[PDB]
Design a protein around this ligand. Structure first.
Ligand code: 1CP
Ligand code: 1CP
Lengths: 357, 357
């Protein structure tokens, strides 16, 4: 196996244990805001980068050379799963991901792979994880991840990003049967993939329901939540059955304010929050038995270093010291200053210690 | 290729030929004792400096603008090799180099790169060498370098400097198999790196066995010397096979008094000496068929310029005019006066000429 973990603060917090300080990581900590990321990425197309264990390992490590983050997240993408299901996907400059042949009718499901063979198609991800776990040498825990079923469905049907998800929601209302079929295919692909990430060396798992906020409560409960629940249940079961230690699982439903109570009951150790939910309100919705992660407005990092410190102070005061992992409320943007990211990390560490003594 | 070499005194001496005067260079001639070095270094972290061909070229050239040294040594560091093997390394203010995750058990070797890919990771070094060779414009020869296997092993296991090397020596005594494995990985990384330095423009190579003195004869013969021999043999072989002219190779084993006889038989043109060995004794140990380099106590440069001249006279008298390159017995210290370094250089040149006519 692997080097002994030296800083386990993130894991202890995820499981709800007291720690000496609040651990912090940043969504998209490996990203274009780092000049060195841009340089490493310049050599290959995006999905080819994802296919290279050494390139993924390098990108994962880059933020940790700059900042004393309490976790690493593997460099990959949520869209590797629809790709592995047999959909062609491109990264378009300045526009983002595109599926040139999205799913538009129920007959389109015929082209997908059997979900049970998807993990075998994602071996490159597992290779990256194993390599990164070795190279991290126990410094901090490594997080694996995937997209939640609904969020992946939206990319597969919309063919990319969308402001309304009108085509994907039209499936939910006009094609409910075919939608449940597709959501089950995705769940069945995700479970062995997530399990494989842990087998390969992942020490925690985060499921990104990035497109939660388009649904609202009734649709979310019918078409998103049952699959979010199934992923966590099945992953923990398969890990037990394999003789392995289950890992803490995080559910992040961006713009999912309306689902917080349900998500705290969905079998995830940690519930991630966007910046629109006030920390004290979130604590009320989720209760005392899950850990919260988040939730600073990423745009706050445009403020001066001093201002970032005061915003971080306020955030930490509102969350309190227990059952909390600090992060942004969404990923870092490409135009952010790495020094200001550094200021965020330093302020969490400094103030969370003051809030304990 | 490159400009014709104008002053080849250093090379002629290294190969054991008569020269009109004794050539001189100073270990760490690019260093903090120069105000202009401090200024150039202020802009980046140490390893980032090493990654910049222009910064390395500038640092290499700086001492040559002050002093008529008979060789330049490329600005780099021995620890680029363990870094290129996949270990993370930092420079800590006032403390020096640190590996936050040193090798402590045999399983830790799993995280290292295959040694055959290391040279590709060190392309930046070769870029610096090529640039510096061009910019030197034939003034004097350019020396490339690396750390010897044992010395690199000590940094990788200790995680930095050490007064005893107790952890690294514990490997030798308790983990001899794993030690030989690691020493072979390092040798196999070093050879293509050294060859690449010559391909890139290096005109001589120096291998630094800085931590020799901790071993004593039995351990040195089992764990240091075989790899010192292998590096020289394999480097010269690969250069021949590539159609290239082999370069003079220097072995400097600090505090290696006990190994001098063996080092003179290890396939290096030049044996470097620390200041604790009396020049006449060294000549006795090594014989008449290698060149000696050294060996003035760097602290002697704290003495007045007149005193430096007399100490240099005595040193040159003891070494004699043949098969000798003047240098210090260790690197220049940060608090030394550049004018006194100038006095050393001038005295070697002046007195070595008097000792011939
Ligand atoms: C976890 C993760 C993701 N992407 C990347 C990582 C690796 C971790 C890290 O980079 O630190 C690399 C990762 N992936 C991508 C990038 C940008 C790369 C580049 O510009 O070179 C990076 C750093 C490409 C990408 N990939 C994706 C998009 C968004 C498309 C849209 O506008 O709707 C984009 C732009 C799909 C994607 N990918 C991801 C999400 C979840 C968003 C959330 O809820 O926080 C989504 C929706 C998650
Ligand atoms: C050949 C060389 C070295 N370092 C440097 C050079 C470039 C040549 C030149 O600077 O003139 C730059 C070079 N490298 C460094 C510096 C200091 C830079 C600074 O303070 O800004 C310089 C000038 C950083 C460094 N790098 C290292 C240390 C020592 C750690 C310890 O205490 O054990 C240090 C302090 C590792 C190192 N590096 C080196 C050795 C061999 C020592 C010997 O036997 O003579 C070693 C052991 C060799």
């Amino acid at each position: 196996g692997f080097p002994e973990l030296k800083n386990d603060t993130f894991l202890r917090a995820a499981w709800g244990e007291e720690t000496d300080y609040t651990p912090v990581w940043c969504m998209r900590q490996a990203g274009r805001y780092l000049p060195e990321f841009r340089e490493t990425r310049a050599a290959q197309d995006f999905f080819s980068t994802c296919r290279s264990p050494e390139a993924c390992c390098e990108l994962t490590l880059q933020p940790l050379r700059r900042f004393p983050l309490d976790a690493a997240i593997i460099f990959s993408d949520i869209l590797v799963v629809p790709q592995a299901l047999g959909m062609e996907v491109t990264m378009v400059p300045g526009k983002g991901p595109s599926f040139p042949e999205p799913l538009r009718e129920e007959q389109d499901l015929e082209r997908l792979r059997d979900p049970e063979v998807v993990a075998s198609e994602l071996g490159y991800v597992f290779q990256a994880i194993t390599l990164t776990r070795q190279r991290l040498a126990g410094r901090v825990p490594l997080i694996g991840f995937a997209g939640a079923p609904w969020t992946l469905m939206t990319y597969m049907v919309e063919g990319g990003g969308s402001s309304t998800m009108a085509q994907a929601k039209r499936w939910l209302y006009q094609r409910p049967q075919a939608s449940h079929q597709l959501l089950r295919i995705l769940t069945d692909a995700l479970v062995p993939y997530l399990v494989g990430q842990v087998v390969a060396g992942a020490q925690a798992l985060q499921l990104f329901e990035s497109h939660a906020g388009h649904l609202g409560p009734q649709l979310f409960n019918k078409f998103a939540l049952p699959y979010i629940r199934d992923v966590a249940k099945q992953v923990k079961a398969r890990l037990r059955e394999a003789g392995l230690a289950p890992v803490p699982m995080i559910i992040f439903a961006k713009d999912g304010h309306f689902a917080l109570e349900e998500l705290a009951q969905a079998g995830y150790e940690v519930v991630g929050l966007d910046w629109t939910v006030a920390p004290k309100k979130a604590r009320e919705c989720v209760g005392k038995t899950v850990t919260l992660q988040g939730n600073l407005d990423p745009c706050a990092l445009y403020a001066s270093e001093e201002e970032i410190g005061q915003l971080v102070k306020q955030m930490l005061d509102d969350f309190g010291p227990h059952r909390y992992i600090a992060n942004l409320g969404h990923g870092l943007y490409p135009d952010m200053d790495p020094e200001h990211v550094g200021a965020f990390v330093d302020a969490v560490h400094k103030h969370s210690r003051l809030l304990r003594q």
